[PDB]
Structure formats: C-alpha cells, structure tokens
C-alpha cells in the first residue's frame, strides 16, 4: 500500500512507495515495536539472487535496464559465482553501491550529501601495512586542511570468514581511556577495552586525557598489527568559548575528522568487513554525547562549577544551562579554526529538504526518528515534528561483532 | 513471538527481560518490514466480539485480586455472559471500573508519569444523563484534582457507549485550555492549537473576550444530544504567572499558564466496553509548557521575543540562541510553579523516576510497554536517563485510545 507521513508543524504530507522495495527485516512485528532497540533481531544459491537484485537496480539507475550490457553482466556474474563461489564488482558498481549504502542509512541525518562521496577502492590490499597506507591517504584526503571531504576506503570482501580484513578501531581517530587504581577513568571511558588491547600488543601509552590511539589493523584474517598515524595528519581543535575566557582552561580538545571504521558494507550479497568512512561532525556529537554522556567524558559538573551555577536541585536546570554553553564552545572553536562542522539546526533543516527530494525523485526515504532527532533541544528542530518511516534497503551499512570476540590468535 | 525479549540500558549496562509482551492485544502498525514508531496515530461490538473481550478482562481482574478460578470469579463470568446474551452489553462493578481505569494508565506506553498509576482517584459518573450533570461532575473533578495547588491525579468516567448514536463526549481536548483567534491579517491571538475549537465555541454562542489567555468554555455532549456550553467558575481555574529568578524583565512578557493538565478527548476501553468521555488529569512536567506550549513554532512561539530580551545574537543558528532562550524559559516555568506551590516536575526528576518505575514493572509484572519517541523529553534528551534506555512498545488492555473529533461525526439534531 501507499503510506503517508505528515509533518505536524508544516502539515506537509508525503507519500511513501519506496518501502515496497524492502525485503529485509526491521525487527518489529505487528504486535511489538522495537524502534528503540539499538541492534534489533553466503552460498552460490543465496548469492545469485542478491547479486541479480543489485545488478538490476544498478542498470535501472543508469536507465539501461534490460540492455545488452545488463544481460551480459548478469551472465558474467552467474558464471563467476559458479566457478569461484563469489564474484567481483565493477568499479562503477562499487561506487554506486557505496553511495547507496549511505543513501539508505536510515540513521544518518547528513544524507543530503550522499552522492558526494569519494570512493577509494582498496580491494587489491593484502597486508596490514597496505591497510595503513590506504588509511593514511584516506585521512589526508578527507581532512583537506580543515575543508572536510566525505570519503570511504573499501578493503577486500569476505571470502570464507577466516580471512576477514578488519579495522579494530571503532573510529580511525579516537582518544585512549585508562582505568585508574582509584577506580576512576582517565580519557575516554568508551575506549578502555580497546586501549588495553593496544597496550598488551605493545603500544606505549602516554597516559593522558586525549592521547590519539594507534591503528590496529587486521588483513586476510591474520593477527592485527599496530601503527601510529602520522601526527601531521591528525587535525585537532582546542575548545574555547566566545564569552567565557576560563573555558580554554578546561583543557578540552577534539579531533576534526569523524571516521567510523567498524561497520560492515553490504553490496549485492558481498560483504566488506573493513570499510572506513568519514564525513564531518554535527556539533552535538561532540558537545552533547562525547563530552556530556555520563559514561563518556562527563564534564557537565566541572563546567557548571566554573559557571557558578546552583547545582543543588535538578529543577534549576543547571545541567541544561551548562550543556548549551559547551555546545556553543564546540561550534565556535571549529568555526574559528576553519574546520567543517554543522550545527543541529542547520543539519536537521537540510535533512527535511533531503526527505522532500527523496520523496519526489525516489518515492521515499527510510529514516529512524530515534537517531535523526538531535540529543538536545529536540522539538525546536524540524525533524522532531516530522513523521518518518523506517525500513531496510540494500546496499547497506550493518553492525558487526567486535573482532576481539571472534579472533583466534 | 519469542518468550523472552531483552532490553538494555546503554549507560548503566542494566539488562531487563520482558515477558509481558506475550499479552499484547492490539496492533502497533509496524510490520516485519517497516517500523511506524514515529507515526503519531498509526457501529459497536457485536455479542460475539464482546464475550471474549469481557472474559479476558474479568479473568485479568480476578487474577489481580488473587481469586482466579474462585466461585466469585466463575459466578461473575456467568453473570457477565448472561448480561451480554440478553442485553448485548454489560455493566462493570465499581471495583472493576476502578481497576480498569488504573490499568489503562499503567498501560499507557507514552506516559512518563506512570510511577503514580495506582494513586488515581476514580469518579464514577455513569449515572449522568445531561450536559448540566456532566458540568457538575467536571467542576467537582477540577476542584478535587487542583486541591489548592497540591494536585491529585483523577479520572471522571461518564456512561459507556451503547449503539454509538448516544455517546457522551467532552468536545474540549483538555478541560482547561486557552482560546485561539485567527485575525483578518493572518496572525493569531492566543493559542493557535485551539483555533478550530474556539471557532466552534463562538458559533455555539460563546462570547469571546479576545485575549491571549482566555480560558475556553466547556462544550459538553450527553447521550448523543447536541453539545452545550458552560463557563468553568474562574475560582476553580488555578493559574501561574511566569517569572524568572534572575531576569526581572521576564514577568513583563505577560505569560502565565494553568496548573491542571486534564486531557478530555480520549477513549477508555475496558473489557470491550467503550467510555468515550473519561477526562483525566495529573500534574505537569515543566517541558510540556516551557518547550512545547511556549516554544513550538505552531504554538505561542516565544523564543524570538525572549532571545531579544536576552540580547542574544540571533543572526546565525550556530550561536545556539534558540537553545539558550529555551533553557531560560523552562527555568522560569519551574521556578514560577514551585514559588506558587503548584505541583510540577522537571524532566530530570520525571525521567529518573520513570526508569525506577520501569525496572519495578519488569520485576513484578514481566515488563513495561514504553514509547521512546514520546517518553524522551523535547529538550536535552540525552542527558536524561530515558534516552539511553531501550524500550519495547506494545498495546495492552485496558487502554486509552484516540478517537475522532466529535464535530466530524456528530449528527446535529
Ligand atoms: C558528511 C557529513 C555527515 C554528517 C553531518 C553525518 C551525521 C550523522 C550523525 C550525527 C549520525 C548519528 C551518529 C551517532 O549518534 O553516533 C550519523 C549516523 C550515521 N552515518 Fe552519517 N553523517 C555524515 C556523513 C556520513 C557518511 C559519508 C556516511 C557513509 C558513507 C555516513 C553513514 C552513517 C551511518 C551508517 C550512520 C548510522 C550508524 C549506526 O547505525 O550506528 N554518514 N550521521
Ligand atoms: C501524575 C502526573 C503525570 C505526569 C507527570 C504525566 C506526564 C506525561 C507526559 C509528559 C506525557 C506526554 C504529553 C505530551 O507530550 O502531550 C504524557 C502522556 C500521556 N499520559 Fe501521563 N502524566 C501524568 C498523569 C497521567 C494520568 C493520571 C493519566 C491517565 C489516567 C495519564 C495518561 C496519559 C496518556 C494516555 C498519555 C499519551 C497521550 C497521547 O498518546 O496523546 N497520565 N504523560
Ligand atoms: C557507538 N555508538 C553507536 C554507533 C555504532 C556504530 C557501529 N558499529 C557506528 C556508529 O556510527 C556513528 C556515526 C557514523 C557515521 C558518521 C558520519 C559523520 C558523522 N559526523 N558522524 C557519524 C557518526 C555509531
Ligand atoms: C495533540 N497533542 C497530542 C495529544 C493527543 C491526545 C489525544 N487524543 C492526547 C494527548 O495527551 C497528552 C497528555 C495526556 C495526559 C497527560 C497527563 C499529565 C500530564 N502532565 N500531561 C499529559 C499530557 C496528547
Ligand atoms: C536506547 C536508544 O535506542 C539509544 O540510546 C539511542 C537513542 N538515539 C540515538 N541517536 C543517535 N543519533 N545516536 C545514538 O547513539 C542514539 N542512541
Ligand atoms: C512526528 C513525531 O512522532 C511527533 O512529533 C511526536 C514526537 N514525540 C512526541 N513526544 C511527546 N511527548 N509529545 C508529542 O507530541 C510528540 N510528538
Ligand atoms: Zn516499530
């Protein structure tokens, strides 16, 4: 059926037909909704229909569906699956597939940019040193001296599952976290486990609050190897406040390049277990989640102190006051250093325009409201009032288990 | 359906196990291929439709009082069955009516205030026959629930639906709300949310003061008759002028709000019976007023005026002037209610209590249905603990349901 979504602020109604293309599960049923669960829920015979589905939509996308080239490609793919139990994507298909995985990412508010994505084909890589080289080139290209450019680097696809390429880091650039004898945590508590693994593998830790972690890289199923990203490639921003001259004394900083490296890219039944991709930050990612989550840097209290807020009662909203000032500081700092960043107002506005585009040209846009709405000031952004339909389309980015929970050394 | 579904809190690592979902009775709108979790809303019961709905409820009631399978249980079942058989409907006992109302609240997945569910004063108004009688019942409810600022949660329940042509309805969406008036120039005075209802009241004979905070009259329908207008005695309507602890100028904005949130357009379903007029009230979470009522673009929309008075740079969005003003407005609302000793709860306290409530429900009841999209507050979401809490949404009965606006269905006499 045709499904309608309404914006309750503007009363705009859009009609979704694109959901009729989904063949993957969301996790919900008729009787239970799992919309707020973070992670709900080949063979030759499994592989060909997936391959075919994808080749078909590619040839449909370039308006040569049912052409000689299309027919020929299907036959070529079939033979390849027969003789080798898999197949290799064309360069054009790899690029189409990676852009569409981003386009289909229901949780991403930045998708208006989806067709501007620099794709680096790294399928000829064989060793962790090669992975390191490719990742350095990615970081340098994407960073671009502060004028950030969206990019993805794609390593060889899974074969038997015993020879996976994996970036063990959850992001290319992250700060270490250390357990202290007195029970507290220095640096980023999110990365304590990963940090311990690096240390055991031989990394010499500086034991600071913002130590850039080394890369831990796994090629062809072999044991992962450590590498230090050259420091001149790691762009960072000291956080200061435009009004509070004391804010810089907090000693806060962050890195300019958000580069998620732990997801799995699926295109046409093929699985790319190492596919680091990066765009640029939305301010709240750092200012709200990274700095203010209780389980992260958890800085609200320190900031509220310097602001001399009365922190005795929750109803003083001292947390909300400090939260805004911290996010002002992050935006101000990235902007002053000419490092690309977007605020949550601008970002969500662009997303609404994006949805409108996709409904017109594509018949819809899968979107996860739980993730799209920013972690602060929700209802003063336009996405809060926008009904969204969430459904799964392929190509897609997927969660995968942490490699230390699967790897035999 | 798997017997055990786990939910996780990503902040605390606490894992809860839900079995109560197996008792789900209605559809969510989601399917295996699509989720409609952010969709706002995704001729009577026949005898044969009514029997099993009633039995399900009666069984649940007797199981709750630890008399399942008892002689009193079996006799009640037989008496209900005979009544349906001979009259096509049945009447709830007062005990069942109270239990039913409390459980509709306990089951309301969108409600963050449910730690309070068992403390609900239930007013049985099933003897009511006229709009004047409805008015009397509603005045008493307002006075009791208000309690001079020490608010007490309450529900008043009018006669259930019969053939669908004799419905009792409160035409208001809440017992107390402010009028809205569309001007010839396109601007709106008062609350733009209530323009349609206000126009209906005016057509019915209401004489509007045409101010910014005019308390609307009650428009009350009894036994399917045409609705009738009444003015709530102003001494029954507790209001709070909004001021700020730091900004002396804030009072000069002339804002105020009413103390009692009393939703009156929902339908209460118990054992297949339909109570189309069941106004209920609790007390406010501050963000309901300070974020939504005041700062929604389609409501009072005061952010700009406050920002100006705060002397903020409103030229770029990235100065976060809107966010800054929004916090000060919510501080003012909480400060003003607490100063006037009118019950209100801030979003940090409310969400913290809800997590405690949910954990208790998982332990005593096997689960707690919750709609994350509604439970997470409209400001500062991720610094409240509910943001980090996985939830399962499903529909249990008794329940509060949406129903069509009565002016769209009413057959004018
Ligand atoms: C260009 C600027 C971009 C912006 C401003 C942006 C913004 C965001 C934000 C704020 C989130 C939520 C992240 C979180 O809360 O952890 C997100 C999620 C996501 N983004 Fe984007 N993004 C951008 C580019 C990209 C690119 C280039 C890709 C892939 C090629 C991508 C793929 C994804 C995916 C797969 C998720 C969801 C991950 C998950 O399910 O856990 N994004 N995005
Ligand atoms: C006692 C203090 C209470 C508090 C603090 C509270 C809090 C809330 C809040 C903040 C919402 C979201 C409202 C919105 O965004 O429009 C809500 C929704 C709701 N509440 Fe409660 N509530 C309370 C009492 C009650 C009572 C007494 C009942 C019924 C007997 C009730 C039933 C509901 C229902 C059915 C919804 C969902 C309404 C809808 O889907 O449109 N609540 N509550
Ligand atoms: C650990 N928090 C949940 C999470 C898990 C995974 C995985 N696997 C990826 C995630 O991706 C977040 C993400 C992904 C892509 C982004 C692109 C740009 C940007 N600014 N942020 C972006 C943020 C998030
Ligand atoms: C148009 N706004 C959405 C909406 C629709 C309906 C209906 N029908 C009811 C609604 O109820 C909101 C509600 C219900 C009960 C409450 C109890 C206490 C409280 N503080 N707020 C409370 C708020 C909301
Ligand atoms: C439990 C809940 O689903 C979880 O905390 C989600 C909520 N929404 C989110 N939204 C974004 N953008 N990022 C997140 O990590 C989360 N976390
Ligand atoms: C489109 C979206 O479902 C809609 O704006 C919802 C979002 N969450 C909400 N949450 C609450 N508490 N109240 C609301 O009115 C809404 N509106
Ligand atoms: Zn769902």
Pick from B296, B331, B392: CB nearest A34: B392
Pick from B11, B28, B377: CB nearest A28: B28
**A336 lies in a domain?**
yes
Q: What phi, psi does A93 have (nearest 5°)?
A: -75, -40
Q: What phi, psi does A15 have (nearest 5°)?
A: -110, 125
**A218 lies in a domain?**
yes
Q: Could you tell me if B328 and B368 lie in one domain?
A: no
Is B387 known to sit in a ligand binding site?
yes
Contact present, A254 and A271 (Cβ < 8 Å): no
Chain B nearest-CA distance from A23, in A, is 7
From start to end of B324-381, where are the E strands? 344-345
* Contact flag A331-B320 (C-beta cutoff 8 Å): yes
Contact present, A392 and A22 (Cβ < 8 Å): yes
Q: What is the DSSP letter of A120?
A: E
User: CA-CA distances (angstroms) from residue A31 to A133, A145, B25, B28?
Assistant: 50, 51, 8, 6
- Experimentally determined by: X-ray
- Report the alpha-carbon distance of residue B61 to residue A314 in Å, rounded: 39
- Report the alpha-carbon distance of residue B357 to residue B53 in Å, rounded: 28
Q: Which residue, A331, A346, A361, sits at the end of a domain?
A: A346
* Contact flag A3-B34 (C-beta cutoff 8 Å): yes
Half-sphere exposure of A252 (CA within 13 A, CB side): 24
CB-based pocket (< 6 A), ligand 2: B 105, 108, 110-113, 116, 120, 153, 155, 280, 282-283, 285, 288, 345, 350, 374, 400
Question: For residue A109, which atom of ligand 5 is closest to its CA?
Answer: 12
Chain A nearest-CA distance from B99, in A, is 24
Half-sphere exposure of B248 (CA within 13 A, CB side): 0
Q: What phi, psi does B329 have (nearest 5°)?
A: -65, -40
- Report the alpha-carbon distance of residue B378 to residue B296 in Å, rounded: 10
Q: Please give the angle made by the CA atoms of A85, A86 and A89, to the nearest 5 degrees.
A: 165
Q: Which ligand is nearest to the CA of A110?
A: 1
Domain span at residue A108? 16-123+150-160+264-278+348-372
Q: Could you tell me if B122 and B134 lie in one domain?
A: no
The single residue listed with the structure tokens 């090669």 is A130
Catalytic residue list of A: 108, 111, 280, 285
- Report the alpha-carbon distance of residue A279 to residue A223 in Å, rounded: 29
B321, two tokens: 């002037």
Q: What phi, psi does B204 have (nearest 5°)?
A: -80, 0
- Burial (CB count <10 Å: 0-12, 13-18, 19+), residue A398: middle
Q: Could you tell me if A231 and A199 lie in one domain?
A: yes
Contact present, B378 and A378 (Cβ < 8 Å): yes
Residues in chain B: 413
B121-124 and B15-18 strand pairing: unpaired
Q: Is A373 on the interface with B (CB under 8 A)?
A: yes
Contact present, B179 and B265 (Cβ < 8 Å): no
Contact present, B388 and B14 (Cβ < 8 Å): no
A305, two tokens: 């102190």
**B9 lies in a domain?**
no
- Which residues 6+ apart lie within 8 Å of A288 measured at CB? A323, A326, A327, A374, A375, A376, B382, B383
Q: Is residue B288 flagged as an active site residue?
A: yes
Q: Could you check whether the bond before residue B398 is cis, i.e. omega within 30 degrees of 0?
A: yes
- Report the alpha-carbon distance of residue B221 to residue B390 in Å, rounded: 42
Residues flagged as binding site of A: 36, 108, 171, 280-281, 285, 370-371, 384, 399
B196 closest CA partner among B402, B407, B404, B40: B407
Q: Could you tell me if B32 and B92 lie in one domain?
A: yes
**A391 lies in a domain?**
no
Q: Could you tell me if B131 and B229 lie in one domain?
A: yes
Q: Could you tell me if B357 and B276 lie in one domain?
A: yes
Q: Is A328 on the interface with B (CB under 8 A)?
A: yes
**B383 lies in a domain?**
no
Q: What is the CATH number of the domain that holds A309?
A: 3.90.1230.10
A388 closest CA partner among A364, A369, A408: A369
User: CA-CA distances (angstroms) from residue A268 to A17, A109, A121?
Assistant: 22, 25, 16
Q: Is A295 on the interface with B (CB under 8 A)?
A: yes
Q: Could you tell me if A128 and A225 lie in one domain?
A: yes
Is B402 known to sit in a ligand binding site?
yes
- B36 C-alpha to center of ligand 6: Å? 13
Q: Count the Cβ atoms, other than its own, within 10 Å of residue B343.
A: 18
Q: What is the DSSP letter of A288?
A: I
* Contact flag B21-A31 (C-beta cutoff 8 Å): yes
Q: What is the CATH number of the domain that holds A188?
A: 3.90.440.10
Q: What phi, psi does A339 have (nearest 5°)?
A: -110, 125
- Burial (CB count <10 Å: 0-12, 13-18, 19+), residue A324: buried
Max intra-chain CA distance, chain A: 74
User: Which residues does residue B15 pair with via DSSP β-bridges, in sequence order?
Assistant: B8
User: CA-CA distances (angstroms) from residue B108 to A301, A385, B157, B396?
Assistant: 35, 21, 17, 8
* Contact flag B291-A380 (C-beta cutoff 8 Å): yes
Q: Does the CA dihedral A313-A314-A315-A317 come out positive or negative?
A: positive
Name chain A contacts of B380, Cβ cutoff 8 Å: 319-320, 323, 376-377
The single residue listed with the structure tokens 């197949």 is A87
Name chain A contacts of B31, Cβ cutoff 8 Å: 26, 28-30
Is B213 known to sit in a ligand binding site?
no
Q: Is B33 in the pocket of ligand 4 (CB under 6 A)?
A: no
- Report the alpha-carbon distance of residue A355 to residue B280 in Å, rounded: 38
To the nearest 10 degrees (0 to 180), the angle between helices B71-87 and B47-64 is: 160
Q: Could you tell me if B211 and B293 lie in one domain?
A: no
Number of domains chain A is built from:
3
- Report the alpha-carbon distance of residue B387 to residue B371 in Å, rounded: 11
The catalytic position among B76, B96, B106, B111 is B111
Q: Could you tell me if B209 and B224 lie in one domain?
A: yes
From start to end of A17-117, where are the E strands? none
- Report the alpha-carbon distance of residue A315 to residue A114 in Å, rounded: 42
* Contact flag A317-B324 (C-beta cutoff 8 Å): no
- Report the alpha-carbon distance of residue A233 to residue B14 in Å, rounded: 39
A340, two tokens: 């690309």
Q: Could you tell me if A252 and A202 lie in one domain?
A: no
A215, two tokens: 């890369």
Q: Is residue B111 flagged as an active site residue?
A: yes
Burial A187-218 (b: 16+ CB within 10 A, else e): bbbbbbebbbbbeeeebebeeebbbbbbbbbb
Name chain A contacts of B24, Cβ cutoff 8 Å: 31-32
Q: Count the Cβ atoms, other than its own, within 10 Å of residue A368.
A: 22
Q: What is the CATH number of the domain that holds B105?
A: 3.90.340.10
- Report the alpha-carbon distance of residue B238 to residue B258 in Å, rounded: 6
To the nearest 10 degrees (0 to 180), the angle between helices A68-84 and A44-61 is: 160
Q: What is the resolution of this structure in A?
A: 1.9
A131 closest CA partner among A120, A119, A122, A118: A122
**B64 lies in a domain?**
yes
Q: Is B88 on the interface with A (CB under 8 A)?
A: no
- Report the alpha-carbon distance of residue B228 to residue B220 in Å, rounded: 5
- Report the alpha-carbon distance of residue B405 to residue B413 in Å, rounded: 18
Residues in chain A: 409
Q: How many beta-carbon pairs below 8 A join chains A and B? A: 207
Q: Is residue B295 flagged as an active site residue?
A: no
**B115 lies in a domain?**
yes
Q: Which residue, B311, B331, B349, sits at the end of a domain?
A: B349
- Which residues 6+ apart lie within 8 Å of A376 measured at CB? A284, A288, A323, A324, A327, A344, B323, B379, B380, B381, B382, B383
Half-sphere exposure of A178 (CA within 13 A, CB side): 16
Helix (H, G, I), strand (E, B) or coil at B329: helix
Closest Cα to atom 4 of ligand 6: A385
CB-based pocket (< 6 A), ligand 1: A 102, 105, 107-110, 113, 117, 150, 152, 277, 279-280, 282, 285, 342, 347, 371, 397
Contact present, A5 and A386 (Cβ < 8 Å): yes
Secondary structure (DSSP) of A56-103: HHHHHHTT-TTSHHHHHHHHHHHHHHHHHSS----HHHHHHHHHHHHH
Q: Could you tell me if A87 and A186 lie in one domain?
A: no
User: Which residues does residue B180 pair with via DSSP β-bridges, in sequence order?
Assistant: B190
Contact present, A254 and A239 (Cβ < 8 Å): yes
Half-sphere exposure of A106 (CA within 13 A, CB side): 21
Secondary structure (DSSP) of B139-167: HHHHHHHHGGGS---EEEEPPPPSSSSS-
C-alpha B323 chain-centroid distance: 27
Contact present, A347 and A282 (Cβ < 8 Å): yes
Q: Could you tell me if B145 and B220 lie in one domain?
A: yes
- Which residues 6+ apart lie within 8 Å of A399 measured at CB? A39, A263, A264
* Contact flag B34-A390 (C-beta cutoff 8 Å): yes
Burial B266-296 (b: 16+ CB within 10 A, else e): bbbbbbbbbbbbbbbbbbbbbbbbbbbbbbb
Q: What is the DSSP letter of B66?
A: T
**B10 lies in a domain?**
no
- Report the alpha-carbon distance of residue A49 to residue A45 in Å, rounded: 8
Closest Cα to atom 37 of ligand 1: A107
Contact present, B381 and B387 (Cβ < 8 Å): yes
Question: For residue A371, which atom of ligand 5 is closest to its CA?
Answer: 10
- Report the alpha-carbon distance of residue A11 to residue B182 in Å, rounded: 17
* Contact flag A380-B320 (C-beta cutoff 8 Å): no
Chain A nearest-CA distance from B11, in A, is 6
Q: Is B38 in the pocket of ligand 6 (CB under 6 A)?
A: yes
């Amino acid at each position: 059926r045709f499904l309608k979504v309404k914006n309750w602020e503007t009363e705009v109604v859009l009609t979704d037909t694109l959901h009729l293309k989904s063949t993957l599960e969301t996790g919900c049923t008729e009787y239970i909704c799992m919309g707020s669960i973070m992670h709900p829920s080949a063979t030759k015979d499994q592989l060909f229909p997936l391959a075919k589905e994808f080749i078909d939509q590619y040839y449909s996308s370039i308006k040569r569906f049912g052409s000689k080239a299309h027919m020929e490609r299907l036959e070529e793919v079939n033979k390849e699956i027969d003789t080798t139990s898999t197949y290799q994507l064309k360069d054009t298909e790899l690029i189409y597939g990676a852009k569409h995985a981003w386009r289909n990412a229901s949780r991403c508010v930045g998708r208006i940019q989806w067709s501007k994505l620099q794709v680096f084909d790294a399928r000829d890589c064989t060793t962790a040193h090669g992975m390191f080289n490719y990742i350095c080139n990615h970081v340098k290209y994407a960073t671009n001296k502060g004028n950030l450019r969206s990019a993805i680097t794609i390593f060889p696809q899974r074969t038997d599952g015993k020879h996976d390429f994996r970036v063990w880091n959850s992001q290319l650039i992250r700060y270490a976290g250390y357990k202290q004898p007195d029970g507290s945590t220095l640096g980023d508590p999110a990365n304590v486990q990963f940090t311990e693994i690096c240390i055991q593998q031989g990394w010499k830790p500086p034991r600071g609050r913002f130590d850039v972690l080394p890369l831990l890289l796994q090629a062809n199923g072999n044991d992962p190897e450590l590498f230090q990203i050259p420091p001149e490639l790691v762009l960072e921003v000291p956080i200061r406040h435009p009004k509070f001259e004391w804010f810089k004394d907090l000693g806060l900083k962050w890195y300019g390049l958000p580069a998620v490296s732990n997801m799995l890219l699926e295109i046409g039944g093929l699985e790319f277990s190492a596919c680091p991709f990066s765009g640029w930050y939305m301010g709240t990612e750092i200012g709200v989640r990274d700095y203010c989550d209780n389980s992260r840097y958890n800085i609200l209290e320190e900031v509220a102190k310097k602001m001399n807020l009365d922190m005795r009662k929750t109803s003083s909203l001292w947390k909300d006051q400090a939260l805004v000032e911290i996010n002002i500081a992050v935006l101000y700092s990235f902007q002053s250093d000419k490092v690309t960043i977007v605020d949550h107002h601008s970002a969500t506005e662009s997303f609404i325009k994006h949805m409108e585009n996709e409904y017109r040209c594509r018949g819809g846009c899968p979107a996860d409201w739980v993730w799209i709405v920013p972690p602060m000031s929700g209802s003063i952004t336009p996405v809060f009032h926008q009904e969204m339909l969430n459904y799964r389309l392929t190509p897609s980015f997927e969660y995968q288990p942490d490699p230390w929970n699967t790897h035999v050394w």
